[model samples]
Target chain A: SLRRGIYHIENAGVPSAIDLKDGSSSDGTPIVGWQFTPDTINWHQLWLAEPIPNVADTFTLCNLFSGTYMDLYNGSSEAGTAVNGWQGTAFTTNPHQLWTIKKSSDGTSYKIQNYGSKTFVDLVNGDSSDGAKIAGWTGTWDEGNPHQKWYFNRMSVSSAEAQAAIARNPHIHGTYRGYILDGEYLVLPNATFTQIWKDSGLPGSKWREQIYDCDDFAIAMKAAVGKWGADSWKANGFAIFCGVMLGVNKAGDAAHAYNFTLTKDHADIVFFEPQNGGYLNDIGYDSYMAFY
Target chain B: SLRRGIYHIENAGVPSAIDLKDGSSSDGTPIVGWQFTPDTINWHQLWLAEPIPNVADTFTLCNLFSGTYMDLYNGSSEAGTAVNGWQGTAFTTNPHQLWTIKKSSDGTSYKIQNYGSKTFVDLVNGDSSDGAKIAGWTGTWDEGNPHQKWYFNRMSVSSAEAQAAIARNPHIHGTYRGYILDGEYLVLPNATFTQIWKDSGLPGSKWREQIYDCDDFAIAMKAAVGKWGADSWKANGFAIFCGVMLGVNKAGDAAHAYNFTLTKDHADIVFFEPQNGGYLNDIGYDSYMAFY
Candidate 1:
C-alpha cells in the first residue's frame, strides 16, 4: 500500500533535500539536491506526492512553491536525462509527471521510477555536495546505488516554525577584511529598498577577484544599507551574496554571494543577485562561519 | 556661433520631441521622436548638445536621463541605420556618439548629421505616428527633407511644472465594456500596491482581442484597484497603459493600454505595462479621451 501526502525527499547518506531550482515557477526549473532547511521549509523544498488516477503505485510529484509537476526534462526515455519541474497537462496524456514510488525492500526507503522513461531518479555523478543535479538513470544501476535510494519524509515544518522564521530577526556578520561584525537586524520599506541599491553604485562597480570579490561585494552591499549591526534592516537588503564565494549562498552552488530582504511589499523574503539586478530565486542558508 | 545647452529636438512639422527610448539607462536606448509633454519635461526628452572638443560645429548630443551620447548603430556610413544612445569613451575616439549639428538654411531648424556615419537623422518611413523609429539617412535626402530637418528648442520644464505634475491627482476615464467611470483618485501603500497586483491575477489572465484586450486590461486593472472614480488611486496602479489601444501610454506606440501609480515611497509617478509585470519605461500621455 502506497501512502499519499506532501514530502521532502531526502538523500540516503545525506540530510540534503531535493528542491525546485530557485523555487522558480518556470516550467524547466530543475530539481537539485540542496541544503535541507529544517527550521524554515520554503514551499520549494516540499513536494506533494499523490497517486496518479487509475495508475497503481504511480504518483504525481508536484512542487509546492512553483505549483508545478516534477517532470523528466522533455520526457526523454534515455538514461542520464535531467529531471526538471514543468507545468502539467491532462493526467492521462502526460506520463512525464508520473512516477512509480517503489518501496525499498528494507521498508524504510524508496526509488522513484519514471513511469514513461522507465529510469530511476539518481543523483548525478554520485556527488553529495550542494547543487548536485539529479537525473533519470537506467534501473539496473539502481540495484544497490546509494544515490538511487531516496526516502519520502513527511513535510512537517509547522506553522510555529514559519512564525519563528519570520519572527527571527535578520542577522548580519562582518567577515570581510574590514570590520568582521555580527548581530540580528530589522528591515526597510519598499521605496528605500530600491532606493539604496540604486544609490549604492555597487551594481555598477566592477567585480574583481582578489580585491573586490564576492565577500567584498556582500560587505559593500551591507555597508551601503547602513545599521551595520543594528536591530533592523537599513539598506534595501542586508548581504545576500557570497553563497558564490563566501560559500554561504542559497543555491548551494560552490561559494558565491547574493542578497535577500524582508521588504515591505514582498510577502516572503526577497532574494536577489547583486551584480545583475535580478531576483536570486534560490533559497538556502548555512550557519555563517566567517569568524574562524 | 551655435548656442549649446540641453534642448528638446521638436519635429518641425509635428512638435514631437526626440527622446531616449523609455529613459532607459541601457547603452542602446533608442532616440524616438515622441509626444512632447510640455508640463513634464522628463529628462529623456532633453538632450545636452555641446561642441565636441577640437571640432567646430560637431557636438555630442547627450541624453539628460540616460547620460549617454547619441551614436549611429555600428557606425555604418550607409543610410537607414538607427541612431542610439551609448556610453562614451575618449573625446578624440568613439566618433559614434558625436554628430555634426548643421543649422538649416532657415536658421530656425537644424540637421543632426552623424560625424562618423556622415548621415542625417531621418524620420523612419516618414510615419508621423508614435513608436515610429528614426534612422540615419543619405546626405542627398537631406536636401529640403522635412524628416531630416530638426530644431533644438531650449529644454525648460520648470520645477513648478514638476510640482503640478506630481501634485496632479491621478485621473481615470472609462472606455471598457463595464463601469465606464471617471474621476481623480488617492493611492495605496507599497504593501497593498504589490498586493493588489499579485492578488488580481491580471498578469496571469489571458489577453483576448476586442473583448479582453488593452482597453479591457486597463479597465480591469482599475476595477481591481479599489476606488474607480473617487479622488485617488486604489489598486497598485491607475490605468497608465493604453498608448497601445486607449492611446494613452508613456511610449508613443500605437493604440495600446497599460498602468501607472503614485504609490507611497516612489519618487515620481511609476508606470508599467499591465500585461507584463515590468516597468513602463516610456513616458507619454494622451488626454485619455473615452467619452465621445
Candidate 2:
C-alpha cells in the first residue's frame, strides 16, 4: 500500500516538483507543476490521499493552502483535458479526482495515472522553468523522459534539522572561493555536519559523476546532516531547506540550488550554497525564490 | 553668468535627471549620472559650486555630499576621459576639477565644459537608464539630445506647496481612475484648484497644447495652486514635491513623468499622475527609481 502522509512529488527527468502557483484563480490559471528548481512543501506541494473510499492506490492531490482539488476538467477521460485545480467543494463525488498510483520499479517513486481519463500526469512540452505547469498526456510512459517519472517523499523537516542542513559545510567536490558574504548566518562550531554530507555520497537519485547539480548536492547534504549530527544542527531558530536561486547562467538567466534558513530576526533570510559550502552575498543570481 | 545654488539638471530628450549614483567610488568607478527617472536633490543630484577661485566662467563642480570634485581622467583633453569622482583634496590644484559653465541663450539651463580637456559634460552613449555615467564629448552640441542640455533649479520643497500641488485636481485632458485614496486631501470645497490649473494655461514653460506632458502638467498645477488657494492646501505634515515619475512609455520601456509626495506617517509616499488624474496600482513598469 502507498504511504498515507504529506509528500513532495518530483518529476524524475528535470528534477522539478509538481507545484501549484503561489496564488489561486479560476479554472484556467496554470498549474505550473513542473520546475527545475527546488521548492518547499506547502499546501501546493503536498500530495495526500482523497478523503473518500478508494479502490487500488488512488488519491486526490489538493492544494493545502487554496483548498483546491486537482481535477481533469469535464471528466472527458481523454488526452488534453487540461489538468487544473477547482474548489474542493465544487463537486461532492468527483470522478476526475481519482489518480491510481503505481510504484516505480525502484520502490522510491511512482507513476500516477488518472483513473477516469486513463491519461498520465506529464510535463507540458517537457519545459524546465520554475513555473512550468503539468498536464495530462496519452503517450506511453517514456523511460527516457524523466518528466513522466515521479519521486515522492514524506516531506518533513524539524526547525533544527533545517538549520543544520544550511550550516553544514560542503567538502566533496567543493571549493570556498568567490562566495558572497554579508547576509544572515547560522554560525556553527566544528565541521561535523560537513563530514556527514561527505560520507553520504549520492543515493536514490544519481551517483557522483552523473548528477552534479546544485539541488542534488543540497538534498544529499540535508539527509546526511539530519541523520548523523541532528542535535547540533537542530538547535538554531530557523526553518531551513533547499532553495532555488533564479540568477544568471552563461546562456542567460538560469536557476541554482542552495540551502536557506528563515529566522524571526526580521524578514532577513540566510542562504547557504552547498556547492562551495559558504555564505553567499549578492552572487550572480538576481533573486532567490521557491524553496523545498 | 551661470546661476549658482543647488539645482537639478534634466536630460531634455528623455526628460530624465542627471543623477549621481547613490554611493561614491574612486577613480575607476563609473559615475551613474545618466537617468530618465526623477530623483531628489542629494549628494549625487546636487551640483555644488567649488570653493576654489574661478576664471572665465570656469569653476569646480563638487558633489555636495561626497565633497568629491568631478574630474577628467589624467587631464586628458580628448574624448572619453573617463569622467569620475575623486576626493576633493586628491591634489593641491587639479586642472581636471575646473569646468567652464556656459548659460543657454534663454538663461534657463547651461552647458558645462571641462576646462582641462575643453570637452562638455556628456551622457555616455546618450543612454536613458539610471546610473548612466557622465563622460567627455567632442561632437557638436546636439540640440536634439537633452542628455547634454541641463536645466538647473535650487532644489527646495515646502510641505504646504507640495501638498497643494498633489491635492490640486487636473483638468483639460484628464481621466479619473485608479488613484490611491487616503493621505492628505486638497481640502478645497470646490474644483477651484482644477479650474485654476486649467485657466493658468501653462506659464514659464508653455501653455495648453504646447506643454502636453506630465511634468508640465505637474508644474502648471503647482503654480496655479500656489497663486490662488495657498492657504487652503497648506496643512500637510511633510515637505513633498511635484516629482517626475520614471515609468513606462510606448516603446517597450521608457519614462513617464509624474508627481509624488512624502509624509511622516511611516515614511509612506503617495504618487499622483496629473495627466489622466488616475491612481495607479503597479501599472506595467518593472520598478521606479529616484524621484525629485
Candidate 3:
C-alpha cells in the first residue's frame, strides 16, 4: 500500500505578494490586496484512492506511490504539487516543497517517511534543498535524511479545503464544496467543486492535506492565478489570475491556460504553457485560468 | 390626528468567573477554575404605546385622548370603559397604581414626573406615587418636574409600523401588527399573518398588509396567504420548542416552533405560540392591530 506524506513551507512573502496582484477594481480584489498572509493562506487537499482504509499501512519510503495516482492541477505546473504522496524508500525534502500525510497523531506531529530521493530534478530550487524538487536517492534510517522527517500541517474544518472536500459528496460525503488554487484564482460563480469516486476506499475520496505551509501553498499556485488586487479593495471580492478558471475552455484543450512560477519577488513568469499567455490575446477566454 | 411615540429599555450584564480551589485532581494534580460575586437584581423590559409621538406632547397640561386602548392580548378588547381626552390634572404614577410619567434610563431609575409641575415619583428611594391614571392636569413648571421632564428613549424602526405610517398618506391613521407574549408553553402551527386595508382616504385603493420585517421595504404582498413558517428549522421535521428533535409530531395543530432564551442560572427557556397567532383565521379580513 502507498504511504501518505506532507511538507511544510513558507511564502517568504516577497514573491507571493508581488505575483498575486492583478486584474481590475470593479471585479474582485487582487490576492495581494486580500493580504494573503501566512495566517490566511489555505492549503490544497488530496483524496485517498480505491484502496486503504482503517488499517494502518507501514511507512514504505517516499513520493513513490503503490496505488493509482492523480494530481490536482491549478491549470499550471504548481497544480497537485501542493499534496504529493509516495511509498518505497527514502528521499530529500526542500524548504518550500509542500505535501500532506495520512497518518494522524495526538493533534501534533505525524510520523512520516520520504519516498522521492534527493536525485529528483529541481523545478525551482534543488542544490540548496529549499523548495527543491525531490527525486530517487539513497535510503537512510534517520528522518533527517529528508526521508522520515518531512510532514505538513493540517488545516481546520472551517477552511476552503474543507468546503472543497465536502463538495465531493455533498449529499453523502458530509461536507461542502472546497477550493483549488489551479494556477488561477479560485473562482466561485454559482459553481461548487466536487470529487467523483472512481472506486472504493478513501483514495480519491478528497482529503485535505494538513502538512504544507499555507503561505507557500498560496504563493506557488498563485503563479498562474493573478496577484491579490489591493489597490481596488473591497470586503470579500478578491481578484485572481486573469484568464484563469477551473475546467477547460472554448479551444477544447487547456487552452488559454498558462503555467507560471511565482518567484520570490511576487512576480509570476509563464514557464509551462506560453501559447495562451501574454496581454495580446485575440480572445477573451485567454485572460483567465481554469481549474481541473 | 393621532401622534406616535416609542421607548426602549436596555439590559446590562456583569461577567463573573468560577472560583477554583488549590486542590489536587483524582490523579493527584493541581486543579483550577473561576469564581463569581453576589447576585444583583437587573432590570426588565417594558413597552407601552400611545397616540402621542413626541415627548413634548406628554406635558401635564396636554390632554390625552382616552378611548378603548389596545391591551397586551394581541387582540382588541371589548370597548366598554369610558375615557376622555387629557385634562390639566395631577395623577400619581407607579408600576401598579394609575398613571405616572416614566422613562427607562438603562433599565434602572425611571424618569417619573406628575402633572406639569416638578413633583415626580422616585423609584430609587421606593417613594412611589400610586393610584393615578393618565389624564390632563394643570401644570406649574418646576425645574425638577417629572411630568414636564418626561424622557422618551429606546427608539427603533418597526418595519411593519413604518410601512403602515407611510401608507397612512400623511393622515397617519392605521394599525400595525405587534408581537405578544403567549403565557402558554405550547408551540404554534404554521400560519400566515395577513391584513386587509381599506384606504379611508381612497376607498378603492385598499391593499393587504404583508407579513415581513419593516426593513425589507421593497417586499410586496404576494397574496392573501397564511402566515409563513420559519424558513428551515421547522421544515426539517424538527420540534422547534424542545431541542431534542428525533421524531417531532408536525401534523398536530400545536407543533413546537420556538426560539430559546437564556436564563441567569445557565438554563434555557423555550417560547412558542399557541395557534400561530390566528394567521389562518381569515385571509382578507380586517384586524385592529393589522391596520395600525
Candidate 4:
C-alpha cells in the first residue's frame, strides 16, 4: 500500500450514500425505502441528495443555476404540507438559499433535497440525465465539498453580532413617508419595489414608516428600493438604517426600538410583495461606500 | 503613580461625596442629551458617570442613524417620553451615538466611562475634534474574534474518520430536484425542470402517480434555454438533485442543485420569471407530471 516509511495514503474518499427505496421503519417514520415509487407520470428526476446530519442550523442545501420549481420535506411522513415555494431574482443565488433541519440535532431523521434535471438518472443524482427520480435523502455528515455538504459552513459571527446589536436596540425614528402601514399598523411598503435613499440627509432621501412586526421581516424598509424614482434609491435599499450602516457605523448605542403608537391620518396605504423585493440579505456596506 | 511597578490591580474604586452628582453615587444609566439650537447646540452631559465610577452599561441615549431622531426622557420629569424624533440618516456620524457603560452580570445598574468627550481628550487630549469615546462597560465576555465567544468549536470523530486514510467518503452528490407529490399520488418530473420526456432507463425512472407524506421531495424535470434562463432558475432556486452516478450508463450530476424537497402542491406554479413563464413568488412551482 505504500513505499515503506513514505507510507501510502489511500484516497481520503468522498462523502457518499446509498439511495434507499420506499418502505417504513419500525416507528412508522418511513425509514429509507428501497422499492418505493411515485404516483405522477412523465416526471423525471432533476436533482437530489440525502439530507445532511440533523443539525438544526443554517446550511446550504444546494445551489442551482436555473429551473422552474422545487419542494422540501422533513421526511416521507411529513405532516400537513411542504413549506412554501419561492421565485424571482430575490430568491436567486446572489444570496444562497439556506435551510434548517428544525430538530436535526436530535433524532436520526432526514430531509430530501431535489430540483430539476435532464435525463432520468441526472435528476436522481443531481446529474445531466434527462429524467431520473430526484434522489436526495439524509445520511451521515460529510465535509468533502459543495455537493456533499448540505448547508454552507458556519454563519458569519460579525453578521450575527450585527443582528444581535440591532435587535438589542432597533429604533426607527420616522415613517417611510409615502409607504403606508398594514391593518396591524405595522409599517410596511404599500408602494411597489422602490429604492431607498443612499444618504439619510436628503428630504426624500430616507423613507420612514411605522413598524410592521408581523411580516417575517419580509416586509420592511430594510429591503425597500427604487423609491422616489432616484437612481440612487435602487442603488441603495429599502431599510436605510441597517443595510446602509451595516459596517459603516455600528450604532452601538442604547438605541431603543419604540412602540411608537402613532399613525398618519391623510396618507393612503399601498402594498408591495415582500418576496419580490430584491434587496433581501444583500444589504451591507458597499465596497464603494466603505472604501470611498 | 510612583508605585506602579509592583502592580496591584484593584477592582475597587470608591469616592467621597464630591464624586456624587444629583446626590446619587452610582452612575445612573449612561444617558446622552442634545438640544436643537440655531447652527450650534450645547452638549449637556446627562450621564451618571459623573456620580459613579466605571458605569458603562447604562443606556446611552441616542438619536437614530439620521439626526431626525433623539432619545429623551419619558417626559419633562424622570418619566418623560423616552421616545423622540428627528429625520433622515443624520445620527450615523454622531460621536455620542454609542454609549459605553458598565453593567453588572446580574443586570442591575450601569456607569458611563467618559461622558464629555473626555476619554478622547485623554487619548489625544489636544485634538478635541477627534473625540472617540473611550468605553469601560462590563466587558463583553471574551467573544472569540470579538464576536462569537459564546460558541464552542469541535470536529466530529465519525466525520473525521470518514475522511481518514482507510474510510474514504468522497462527499460528492447532487443538490436539487423537481420531483413532487400529487395528493394521494407522488409525481416525478420528466426532466429536472419539466414534465416531459420518455424512458431514460433509470431506477424510479418512469412514474406517473405517487404519494408522499406531505413534505416528501420529488424532483421534476424542465428544459432551459440560454444563460439568462439558466441563471434565472438557479438564482430563484427550487430543489434539484445533482452529482449522481449510475455507472457508465448514467451521467454524473453537476451544474444542478444537489438537494431538494416537495415544498408545496400548487397547480399553477411559476418556474421562470424574466423568461416566458415568468411569474412572481405567489404563483408557486408550476404544473408538471411526476412519475413513480
Residues B98-128, model 4: lDDT tens digits? 2234432333222222232322101111111
Cα deviation of B260, candidate 3, in Å: 14
**Model 2 regions lying over 4 Å from their true place:** A34-44, A51-54, A89-92, A139-144, A156-292, B1-292
lDDT of 3 at B211: 11
TM-score top scorer? 1
In terms of lDDT, model 4 sits at 0.20
Best by lDDT: 1
Tell me the tens digit of each residue's lDDT in model 2 across B1-292. 6533334566545555655465464454455555432332233555554333536677766554455667777778677667777665522267777877766544566777777778777777767777776787774433545556667554433333343443442221121111111122222212332345456553333222211334345533443443342222211221123233444443544544454444322133455555544434333332232222
Model 1 C-alpha lDDT per residue in residues A1-292, reported as the tens digit of each score: 4555556788776766778888887878888888775434344676766676778889887675565788988778787898888887325358788888987655677888888888888887667777788899887523767678888875322223223433342422233211111111223333454556677676675554212444445444544454221112111111211111133445545455555555332234455456665653343443232210
TM agreement with the true structure for every prediction: 0.29, 0.27, 0.21, 0.17
Q: What is the interface RMSD of each candidate, in Å?
A: 23.9, 30.8, 21.5, 21.2
Candidate structures ordered by TM-score, highest first? 1, 2, 3, 4
lDDT of 3 by residue, B93-144 (tens): 3111122344334333244333223233221111122211222223333334
Q: How many angstroms is residue A274 displaced in model 2 relative to the true structure, after the best TM-score fit?
A: 27
Which digits, one per residue and each the tens of the lDDT, describe model 4 over residues A1-292? 0000100001111222212112111121211102112221101111111122343332322111111113333223222222212232322321112333222222222232222211001122333222223333434332232222221111112223333333333232221111111101112122222323222112221212211111112212322221121221111111111222211113433221111111122122122222233332222211111000
The best candidate by DockQ is 1
Question: Could you tell me how far off, in angstroms, the CA of residue A286 lies in candidate 3 after the best superposition?
Answer: 59
Worst-scoring 10-residue span by lDDT in model 1 chain A: A233-242
Error of 2 at B253 (Å): 66
